[PDB]
Symmetry: D2
Subunit: 211 residues, 4 copies
């Protein structure tokens, strides 16, 4: 802004598509048909949980004027031990997790959240997504360090073959280790802005995955 | 061009809508319910006929290196006396013309095409759109003169209350005389480029009207 | 109907628009130019606040297998006295409220939330949207009793001239009293499902208003 | 189902994407980097030429109440010896042909149009798309006999490695011989209806290829 009051449009613009490799959960499942159980991984924030409520509360509580809350151990303790009660599970994640359970895959969560003394996020995820004990693995809190992709080594260590995530670093962590990185759309009401350019590495992007 | 190989997208962009007053034929009909017969008008090119085939042929035949064909009387003779055999009627126009016939409206066509000694466009339109004799009026060839909207005076003269068209000058001709100007989308494969910004005057734009 | 693995698409579908009266905040502002200060009203949930985090926590806490939480005063006491710390303010609301405050309009909030003994929602709204105390009015907790219109009487009582809301009942409540009902899009990750058909009464719908 | 006067919409629908493998010409070019000159093939109608003007004239002239014109040699003689002067070349085809000529690829056209005693279509294509005589090959008129695949044998004969087309049979013809079938969108104002479901076999579809 400012911008024209009545900008109008045209049918070239209305029909215009970005060249993105869109996929569905069913297409992913089909692409894996006949493949034995393997390790797969999920990002948490804006991938399986709309957790902006806790991040928003955290900023207001711990650093209303800056971004310091993200490096505040007190914030992470709150975030990892109860504030996910307000996090809303994503339907795309329900469908993916169900599919990987059907396959007998081992399911990992690899998050940029900082590790804390205790955490109840693993419980929240297993409960909300109805993940059986055998498929479930305790959440890996990889942390966040500018200049380093903290997730890549975890994907290698756990032999993760597919990694789902909303951020560029989720996709490149997969690329770093030769895994299949698949993009989930970050919701437009997320407080984590700007939204990433889903498909910017030529990766598969799941349709309708903002909710 | 050039532009990024993998530009990606995000869900804000995917869901983004231009602020346009979109309408359907049914909504227009409803808005006129109970109103007695009146005069209404249609633009021809890219409004009721995809006539690019004749314009394309005309440019190649009469001015392959310039835009002079548009002021060439020989071109207009060909265009108005047979080349509309290759023009493709628009479905939106079939629906609008049917609706105005239901209403008992007088139907006019007001085109920027130049007048010629003879014309068979009136026949083409009445035949293709199944317009009864009573509703049909001979095409008004208003011509094109830079700096002047040649259509406005015709809308006034014929007491035209609604004017349908694809070009900015169709909408402003209606505005000039206090008529209701309603926009039809120009097809993206039209040779008349650039496409106009439908809705740029805050006018109603008919959905799906490119075909 | 079969839902194919590879459904494909076509350019008619890609370009297809629903016939909706889309508007922008700037267009609304323009439509009010020169009009003196008036009373305007807002729905709360999915109109100005993404409050699904608290409603989600409420469902899980108070009625995991039913909708009984929505009639449980213990839930409402939590929801109205602190759980909005986890609600995410909507950008469309920031823009509308700023615009109306700039106009000198009186700002009302009329919600279907159940009334409670105390409420901190009024403070949350005034603080987050930077609403001066003069323009601000205490939230009107109209309640929600299906088969009953509980907002219209309040719109009439406060002479509210424009009412913004996401639900069908918000629009018809406005229409029933002769107010201008303007629709805001409910986010697709709201837990209040199904999503309403914005524009279902021919009302104005604000573009990009899901966030 | 009732088709409401005011159907409305919701943001799930607004953001909804079909799971299609969209590609750009630049991405196709990138995928071929370093690969030596090869034979590539194009369908004609609605792939490189918007030829509906002639097919429309043909239907009206030769079989206004049936599809018999499509099997009438008198129609084909007209269609293949001058009516393409009214066909509108597609921009997507200009870009693809330029790209393949730049690569040093051999260019073939394999059409389901019926063969005629003479044809000027090869010249029309070479002239309009600026195809050097070396890269150019005379159009292969494979014909169209429903229940029969008439293009696959030609793709094999000419060792065509990539085949571009708008119809389902174009894609499956390519797949049947192990060639890369790439879909172009049929324009919504084509008279060949219904429009195909581009992407219905999981094939690549070129973005914005309706014009
Ligand atoms: N502005 C922001 N709002 C909300 N969450 C953020 C923001 N920046 C980073 N995060 C999230 O918090 C963690 C630490 O930066 C990351 O894993 C990231 O997903
Ligand atoms: N570049 C163009 N291609 C096709 N038709 C055109 C072009 N410019 C103008 N026209 C049409 O030809 C007429 C004379 O300019 C106008 O009524 C207009 O609709
Ligand atoms: N599942 C839900 N999620 C969020 N808000 C709801 C839900 N059901 C009802 N509401 C809102 O709460 C109020 C009381 O039910 C209503 O006015 C409605 O707008
Ligand atoms: N109605 C039509 N309009 C345009 N092209 C058609 C139509 N029907 C068939 N064709 C094309 O002409 C050929 C012979 O029918 C086919 O290969 C097909 O692609
Ligand atoms: Mg994330
Ligand atoms: Mg026109
Ligand atoms: Mg609401
Ligand atoms: Mg074809």
């Amino acid at each position: 802004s400012p911008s024209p009051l009545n900008p109008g449009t045209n049918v070239a613009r209305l029909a215009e598509q970005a060249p993105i490799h869109w996929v569905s959960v069913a297409q992913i499942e089909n692409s894996l048909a006949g493949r034995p159980p393997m390790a797969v991984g999920f990002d948490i924030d804006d991938t399986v949980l709309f957790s902006s409520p806790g991040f928003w509360r955290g900023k207001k509580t711990f650093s209303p004027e800056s971004e310091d809350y993200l490096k505040n151990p007190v914030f992470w303790e709150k975030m990892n031990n109860g504030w996910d009660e307000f996090s809303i599970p994503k339907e795309v994640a329900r469908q993916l997790i169900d599919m990987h359970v059907r396959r007998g895959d081992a399911i990992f969560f690899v998050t940029g959240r900082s590790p804390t003394k205790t955490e109840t996020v693993s419980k929240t995820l297993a409960d909300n997504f109805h993940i059986p004990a055998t498929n479930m693995n305790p959440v890996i809190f990889a942390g966040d360090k500018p200049g380093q992709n903290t997730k890549s080594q975890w994907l290698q260590d756990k032999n993760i073959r597919i990694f789902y995530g909303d951020s560029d670093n989720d996709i490149t962590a997969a690329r770093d280790v030769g895994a299949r990185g698949i993009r989930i759309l970050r919701a437009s009401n997320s407080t984590y802005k700007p939204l990433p350019q889903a498909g910017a590495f030529g990766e598969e992007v799941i349709v309708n995955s903002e909710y």
